[PDB]
Amino acid sequence: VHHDGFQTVKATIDWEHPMFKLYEKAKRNGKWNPADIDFSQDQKDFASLTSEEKISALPLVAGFSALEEAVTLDILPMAHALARQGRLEDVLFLTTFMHDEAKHVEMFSRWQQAVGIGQMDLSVFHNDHYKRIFYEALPEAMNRLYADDSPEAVIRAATVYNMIVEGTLAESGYYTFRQIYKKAGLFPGLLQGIDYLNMDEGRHIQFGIYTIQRIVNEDERYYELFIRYMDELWPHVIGYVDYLTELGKRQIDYDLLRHYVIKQFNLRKKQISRT
Amino acid sequence: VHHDGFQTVKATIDWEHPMFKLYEKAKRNGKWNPADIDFSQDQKDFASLTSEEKISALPLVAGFSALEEAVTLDILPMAHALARQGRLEDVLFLTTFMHDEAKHVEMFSRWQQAVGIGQMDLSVFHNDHYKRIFYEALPEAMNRLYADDSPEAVIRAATVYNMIVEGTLAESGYYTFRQIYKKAGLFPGLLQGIDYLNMDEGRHIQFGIYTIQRIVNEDERYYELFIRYMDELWPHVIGYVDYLTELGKRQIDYDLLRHYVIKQFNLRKKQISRT
Numbered sequence: 001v002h003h004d005g006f007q008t009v010k011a012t013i014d015w016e017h018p019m020f021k022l023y024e025k026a027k028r029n030g031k032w033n034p035a036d037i038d039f040s041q042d043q044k045d046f047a048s049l050t051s052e053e054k055i056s057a058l059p060l061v062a063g064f065s066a067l068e069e070a071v072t073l074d075i076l077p078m079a080h081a082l083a084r085q086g087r088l089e090d091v092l093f094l095t096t097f098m099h100d101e102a103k104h105v106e107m108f109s110r111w112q113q114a115v116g117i118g119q120m121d122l123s124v125f126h127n128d129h130y131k132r133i134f135y136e137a138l139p140e141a142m143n144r145l146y147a148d149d150s151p152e153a154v155i156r157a158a159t160v161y162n163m164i165v166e167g168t169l170a171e172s173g174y175y176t177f178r179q180i181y182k183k184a185g186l187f188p189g190l191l192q193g194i195d196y197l198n199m200d201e202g203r204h205i206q207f208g209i210y211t212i213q214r215i216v217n218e219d220e221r222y223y224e225l226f227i228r229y230m231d232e233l234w235p236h237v238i239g240y241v242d243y244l245t246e247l248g249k250r251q252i253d254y255d256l257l258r259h260y261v262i263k264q265f266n267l268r269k270k271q272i273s274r275t
Numbered sequence: 276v277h278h279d280g281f282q283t284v285k286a287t288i289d290w291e292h293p294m295f296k297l298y299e300k301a302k303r304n305g306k307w308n309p310a311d312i313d314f315s316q317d318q319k320d321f322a323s324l325t326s327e328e329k330i331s332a333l334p335l336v337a338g339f340s341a342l343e344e345a346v347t348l349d350i351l352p353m354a355h356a357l358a359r360q361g362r363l364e365d366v367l368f369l370t371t372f373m374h375d376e377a378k379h380v381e382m383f384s385r386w387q388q389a390v391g392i393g394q395m396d397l398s399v400f401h402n403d404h405y406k407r408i409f410y411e412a413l414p415e416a417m418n419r420l421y422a423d424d425s426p427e428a429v430i431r432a433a434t435v436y437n438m439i440v441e442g443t444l445a446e447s448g449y450y451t452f453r454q455i456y457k458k459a460g461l462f463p464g465l466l467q468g469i470d471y472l473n474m475d476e477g478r479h480i481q482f483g484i485y486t487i488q489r490i491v492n493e494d495e496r497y498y499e500l501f502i503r504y505m506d507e508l509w510p511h512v513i514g515y516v517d518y519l520t521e522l523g524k525r526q527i528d529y530d531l532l533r534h535y536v537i538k539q540f541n542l543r544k545k546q547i548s549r550t
């Protein structure tokens with residue numbers, strides 16, 4: 001359907017818009033390139049591990065490669081919905097969001113190639129709870145936006161994508177991987193990549209907060225929706241954590257990683273206010 | 276609808292894919308930031324112009340600001356269609372394509388703000404032919420892809436977007452603006468911006484060529500479709516040129532700019548081969 005006119009012909013970009021300012025920060029701070037990371041020591045590290053040590057690392061990497069690929073693809077309906085609503089500055093910011101996710105996908109796939117597991121099908125480490133989130137709930141919530149961009153639909157999409165997938169699971173996964181391999185002195189290239197990724201994801205969560213809060217600001221009714229959609233997904237979040245915990249104990253303070261996930265989930269709720 | 280699995284979990288990125296290699300070039304060569312351009316001399320230049328000189332520049336700027344805003348918004352259906360087809364490397368490249376267009380929109384809007392015309396509604400310089408392309412045909416061809424990603428629909432979308440809008444009109448517009456103001460010694464900030472934009476658009480046209488050619492390679496039938504869709508839009512291309520020519524003659528070798536447009540249109544055809 002047609003363009004009515006163009007904001008930068010009728011007027012200008014809204015230079016003070018929060019998402020324009022976030023777009024400006026993303027350009028300044030978004031220069032890293034996964035192609036520049038030296039993975040040669042990660043290759044030696046992985047080869048020195050015993051077979052049992054080798055597969056201990058793979059469930060988390062399997063979870064992150066799919067997470068990053070899913071969020072690369074599944075932000076496109078959000079960008080479409082906000083473009084159709086004329087939210088130009090959100091769209092400009094989301095071009096940096098999408099390109100960040102492309103680099104994140106690339107980083108994990110380069111690591112797999114470098115250490116010699118690119119030919120291994122890591123899907124065996126996606127349990128039913130993981131699939132319910134990443135194969136089903138995430139794409140369903142985002143694709144809804146092509147036919148329903150109501151405030152309820154936008155809140156649900158931002159809740160699943162930004163607050164649960166990125167702000168609870170990915171945030172906790174970064175932390176976990178850092179805890180484990182930083183102390184071991186292992187995989188310096190991957191940890192460099194994760195550091196850059198974590199800096200990017202700081203901006204991404206601000207977009208999710210902005211989006212949910214501006215909708216909640218219209219009607220407190222929507223605060224209770226946000227909380228409900230968070231609680232709806234929790235069983236699958238903790239069900240995936242329980243599965244990773246059960247894998248690792250079979251081959252690290254798990255009670256303290258499990259508590260980081262609970263901490264992050266509750267922190268995301270506190271970043272939205274009923275008013 | 277669901278994700279079946281994830282390519283970077285089952286395997287890796289296809290490192291030799293042409294669009295992966297273009298993605299890598301885009302990251303290396305895509306560092307410029309419109310926020311770094313010094314427009315202070317452009318402001319003085321524009322203020323020194325007489326009212327009649329001032330409005331001579333505005334029709335082209337009006338055409339470019341809308342062009343860049345339209346192509347920023349209207350690439351999203353192409354990215355969606357290729358993601359749904361599992362073309363991961365195309366999607367990674369298209370994140371750089373979209374972010375490039377965001378910078379292009381930003382650049383022209385910063386220039387308008389800097390020289391003091393941001394408050395002017397420049398839509399008066401969009402004639403019927405311009406509207407037929409940018410307000411109607413472009414968004415219609417791209418949005419089709421949400422419900423019809425047939426090879427015919429993808430060829431038509433790439434033809435309107437990459438070969439006509441970017442490869443014929445934008446290419447000729449860059450050249451024209453360079454010719455005119457480079458020789459005058461005017462608007463050095465805007466010309467710097469246009470130089471960076473032209474470098475970006477070199478990659479964009481390669482994606483359009485790749486996309487059309489891979490579809491033509493399946494069936495020569497589609498070569499004749501490509502030519503037909505190009506010829507269908509020509510009347511609006513030259514009808515906009517005739518209008519800009521008529522404006523400028525009322526306030527520069529026009530016969531030679533008009534011939535650059537014809538040259539570019541025919542050059543784009545020669546970049547697709549029936550086999």
Ligand SMILES: CCCCCCCC(=O)O
Pocket residue numbers: 059060061063064067169170172173176241244245257258261
């Ligand atoms: C064991 C606690 C860590 C859970 C977060 C894992 C998220 C992911 O791997 O994508």
Ligand SMILES: CCCCCCCC(=O)O
Pocket residue numbers: 334335336338339342444445447448451516519520532533536
């Ligand atoms: C006068 C010949 C130049 C025609 C190309 C203009 C395209 C544009 O302004 O977007």
Ligand SMILES: [Fe+2]
Pocket residue numbers: 071101166201204
């Ligand atoms: Fe993210």
Ligand SMILES: [Fe+2]
Pocket residue numbers: 129239
């Ligand atoms: Fe379970």
Ligand SMILES: [Fe+2]
Pocket residue numbers: 346376441476479
């Ligand atoms: Fe372009």
Ligand SMILES: [Fe+2]
Pocket residue numbers: 404514
């Ligand atoms: Fe006409």
Ligand SMILES: [Mn+2]
Pocket residue numbers: 068071100101104197201
């Ligand atoms: Mn990410």
Ligand SMILES: [Mn+2]
Pocket residue numbers: 343346375376379472476
């Ligand atoms: Mn452009």
